[PDB]
Ligand binder design. Sequence first.
Ligand SMILES: Nc1ncnc2c1ncn2[C@@H]1O[C@H](COP(=O)(O)OP(=O)(O)OP(=O)(O)O)[C@@H](O)[C@H]1O
Ligand SMILES: Nc1ncnc2c1ncn2[C@@H]1O[C@H](COP(=O)(O)OP(=O)(O)OP(=O)(O)O)[C@@H](O)[C@H]1O
Ligand SMILES: [Mg+2]
Ligand SMILES: [Mg+2]
Lengths: 372, 290, 56, 401
Amino acid sequence: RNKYQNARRVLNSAETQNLPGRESQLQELREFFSNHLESQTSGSLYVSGQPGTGKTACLSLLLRDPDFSKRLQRVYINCTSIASVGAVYKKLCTELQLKVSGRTERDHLEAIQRHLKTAKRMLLLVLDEIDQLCTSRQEVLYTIFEWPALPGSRILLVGIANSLDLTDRALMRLNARCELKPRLMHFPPYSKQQIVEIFKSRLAEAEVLDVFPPVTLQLLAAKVSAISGDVRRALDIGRRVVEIAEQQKRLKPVQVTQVAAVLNKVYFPLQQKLMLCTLVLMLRNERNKDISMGRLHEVYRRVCAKRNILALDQAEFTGTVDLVETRGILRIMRKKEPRLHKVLLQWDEEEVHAALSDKQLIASILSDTACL
Amino acid sequence: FVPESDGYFHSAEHEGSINAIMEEYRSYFPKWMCILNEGFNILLYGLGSKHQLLQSFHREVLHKQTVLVVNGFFPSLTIKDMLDSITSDILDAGISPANPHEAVDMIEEEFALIPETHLFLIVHNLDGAMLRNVKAQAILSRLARIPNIHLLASIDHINTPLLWDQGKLCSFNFSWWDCTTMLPYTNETAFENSALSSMRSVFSSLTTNSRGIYMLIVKYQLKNKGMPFRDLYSSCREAFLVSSDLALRAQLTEFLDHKLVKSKRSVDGSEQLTIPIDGALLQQFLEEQE
Amino acid sequence: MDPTISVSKGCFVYKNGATRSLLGKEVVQQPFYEEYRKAWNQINDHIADLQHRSYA
Amino acid sequence: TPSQKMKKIRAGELSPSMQQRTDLPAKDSSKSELQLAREQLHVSVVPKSLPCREREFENIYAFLEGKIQDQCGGCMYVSGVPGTGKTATVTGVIRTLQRMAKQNELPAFEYLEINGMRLTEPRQAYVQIYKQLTGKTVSWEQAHALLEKRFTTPAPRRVTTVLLVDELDILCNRRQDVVYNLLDWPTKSAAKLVVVTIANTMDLPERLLMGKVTSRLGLTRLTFQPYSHKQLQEIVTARLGGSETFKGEAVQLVARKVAAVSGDARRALDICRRATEIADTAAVKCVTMLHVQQALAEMIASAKVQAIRNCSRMEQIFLQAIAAEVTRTGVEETTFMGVYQQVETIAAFMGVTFPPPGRALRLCSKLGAERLIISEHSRNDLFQKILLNVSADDIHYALRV
DNA sequence: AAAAGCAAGCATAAAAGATCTAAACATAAAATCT
DNA sequence: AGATTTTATGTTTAGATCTTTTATGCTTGCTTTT
Ligand SMILES: Nc1ncnc2c1ncn2[C@@H]1O[C@H](COP(=O)(O)OP(=O)(O)OP(=O)(O)O)[C@@H](O)[C@H]1O
Ligand SMILES: Nc1ncnc2c1ncn2[C@@H]1O[C@H](COP(=O)(O)OP(=O)(O)OP(=O)(O)O)[C@@H](O)[C@H]1O
Ligand SMILES: [Mg+2]
Ligand SMILES: [Mg+2]
């Protein structure tokens, strides 16, 4: 309906046609595909980078080009979708309609090699999320990357991954032969101005540019590009600003107060309070931070006795510490017996004191050295 | 070769010469065919690589006989892979049984059923990276015992016959042959079995807050000539480089993945964060970041 | 490099009609192979007879 | 033949009926008022409108109504400690949206739901989501392929589909393929999926999900805080209606002693039912405060001092000597040999003889089966290690006072 | 004074201990031959 | 309208993995007899 729901729809975070931030990367990928088409030679490639930077958007944009539709046979395989690491050849056969004698992965591999030896068109095999193909012996990944070096094969394959060094660390054996190792392409995380240009593209495709003044866009991109640089979190906070402003106001451009509030937002039971205070006391008073559940409960009972309030039994105390564990304040390393489980504090005490919000009690527990 | 124990108790023209040596070893081949016909197996024990010599024997002489080449210098081959290869491709008998000696019993039965179907077996580096256990050598000796299967093999390691007892050395009816080519070990050492620049290349890909966290560890390391985790946590919360503890643990997990930081736990439970690079190069790196 | 040198496989079948006397006829019909086979069969059968008569 | 039954089950053509009672259920008017409170206080009776969860209702309602009307799809992650009204609020929002779509005030939408603990395997969710669509039971590979054919391919008129996913941490595993598919399907434009994920831990996407899965899960999130002293009283007094069968101080004591432990609402609705059952056997018709005190002492039980007082005399000598060896050697883990020597000392003091060590191992095995102590298998006698599971002061409190 | 000898210290590694997963094995749905 | 491989599937057990923890061993740093 209105501009708020229009901007909330258009921020989308789905597939797109225009990619303002990735232009030199698209030109480099087009030059790679074009020179390996004109030379009619095979060529492996490994694109990588942090999640949300837009690798799959670039390759989905380049698998819809009409001229590459004329010149080469596109195949896109998402490697999470296969049932197993060795099953991917079978999926590749279904992407090529190859006839197979069937029901073993070896004959599917021989059918793929027999297709590659006498293919009429160049093959572009994009294997999205190739980190799922890594195992231990890694027969499948080496078998896939050995295909460009096969005699007469015309495959040129692209492997998308989040790891900067998956190619070297996971495929050291391809370094020995320079014809085999993939050309590497990083996708750097988005800068501040690139996120501003992505926002100014998405809000001008629907002409809802006016709901975001430039100052608050340059606050939002300055936070997101400094934290992580993925455009998914940027579009998520940009959608969340409008869907909070719609809930709050019911054209008003969003002010810096709303984006600052959602950015500072994004970026107790009494027995749980007594447990956290006794854990802070035992961690402060003692050099040995190997605290067991029983060693903590024996101090917690004395603290509850000196406070003249009833203490929980060990069977309920274990569930209390497990409920405190869900907040992230603690981490319990499990052992053979419930008494032997090791509590480990994961907040500093300056955060625990501000989280408990009962300073008159923590001043009493932390001054109670004699109950340890 | 008669070594003295006191060393333990006190502890161009070359291409033509190598081509003449290779032509002599190529001239040896019909004698190897008669020796393999009499039931002996061939073993080569020269200095240099013998890959091209056994490939020439497979190419020029065994051009029509059934042949299973086995690359023993492969880091990732298994004896199950070789027994599965024989059982599935030579005999069309499907997958071999999971016990390898049961697979050798099956191969002995199926090869007893077919006389004059000889299977040549070429194993470059019988002392291979995954054949150095006693069990794979027992499987190879039980396979070489078969009258149908003939075996050629290469040897490179000096300590190879320590795993051949007299039973294996009797099953391996070896005819030793000094095929000392002088070729370099290219293919045998090409595999996986045998830095400030990389730190800059991974530092370029990091975001601004990760650059600040690594610069904090670099400043503490150059200031102290491994930092406890609590000082890095308080410095990041003061510099607003992190939202909570768990994001800092995720950043240090990424640094452990990219090997910029080694984590050494203390007896007190605190986590130490060493940077595994000498301090002169670290001081040059800090000067590079300014 | 060589087709036998692969990064993935470790064993390389060169099957030529295997289902489920290596020398040609020039060598087997040579007289020296005949006398060698005769002397070897005689010597091996005599040694096997001695081993059986000692184990009996 | 059984195969026709299994084929009619896997095709969904026979509904799984359960056997009905021979006798009719009793009429509502024969019930006592205390029985009426006992059945209104059952945890299974969800109220039509939940007290003290209005803000979270507006949050989930605004998110789901915007995702349905915009026809875009997306994802949400709600989280909180058990019993805090998560799944009841999400199903209440979805029932309100279905009541609104029935009257054509909203676009219509499909409502799939799964739960991660009803699945034996993480991949079996593919079997179940398809079972909420077609109703056929198929293998997980064919179900995953048909779900990808449904979601990746634009097929107008596609309707919006809301996939509630309870128990998200069970679906994880090491590969995290299932949760990656469930969070990756909304990102495609062809699928109008709006997946909501319920879980307990606040920090789950950062603690155990992968970085791309956390990036797909997004930054829209909601946390259900534990019920306080007052909200637990409002819940129980809403469940009781206008009835005065509960004293107000009794509900106040139930809420005050339940909110101090966990903030679970099921604990309050169970303690009030036990208080009603305690008041029923006293032949009173009002749940006075001492019935609540008895039900609280029963359901927050601490019966280990009773176990040490109920032990046989040689087991009490054993429980004294284990704590005596812990005090003597300092370390908390004692071998059976020094425990037996302290046993002989204490038995020489008290004047009774002690059983020989082959019977003392039977005493140690009984205490280790009762979990008063932790102890090893008895095959390594005299060198087996004996942790004390009960606290050392509880033994003296049992055997003195 | 020269080279064998006792505490120290980090380190590959070895047990282990849970834990998750891949392949071998038992088994059911089903085209196929009669 | 009934028997036979054929194939797709589920279970189980052996092996890969994560993690702690413990130890001999590789090296160091003195240490000390000949
Ligand atoms: N340069 C860009 N301009 C505009 N939108 C973009 C750009 N890059 C990415 N996006 C948006 O971000 C969304 C996610 O990008 P994409 O899925 O390609 O990242 P990714 O690297 O594949 O993530 P992952 O590594 O987790 O798979 C896309 O749907 C797209 O709409
Ligand atoms: N605010 C409330 N008002 C009334 N009843 C409530 C409220 N919160 C919880 N309950 C009761 O307690 C029960 C809680 O069930 P619910 O499914 O909400 O728990 P949950 O938070 O999903 O638990 P888990 O996280 O373990 O799945 C409901 O059946 C409901 O009857
Ligand atoms: Mg992607
Ligand atoms: Mg629930």
